[PDB]
Design a protein around this ligand. Structure first.
Ligand SMILES: [Ca+2]
Lengths: 50, 51
């Protein structure tokens, strides 16, 4: 039984990062790490179905 | 040994985040994910050594 609240919070962080490409551009890895966490979360929620 | 380039880039990102508390504070999880990746990287580099 999975909870969407975490995923929802992450995607709001992601929307925000997308809105600030100038800030994102001064970090080496920051936005990629958020993307990877989001992919991980979605995979987990789906796999707790199988 | 060296050069541990990925770790240095991450730790630079972390210092930059610390330097920008107002920017960091508008996100729910962003800085923690960075902290977690750093710990993971240091752990892997150390474990690769016990081989
Ligand atoms: Ca922190």
């Amino acid at each position: 039984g999975s909870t969407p609240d975490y995923l929802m919070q992450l995607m709001n962080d992601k929307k925000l990062m997308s809105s600030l490409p100038n800030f994102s551009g001064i970090f080496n890895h920051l936005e990629r790490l958020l993307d990877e966490e989001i992919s991980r979360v979605r995979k987990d929620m789906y796999n707790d179905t199988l």
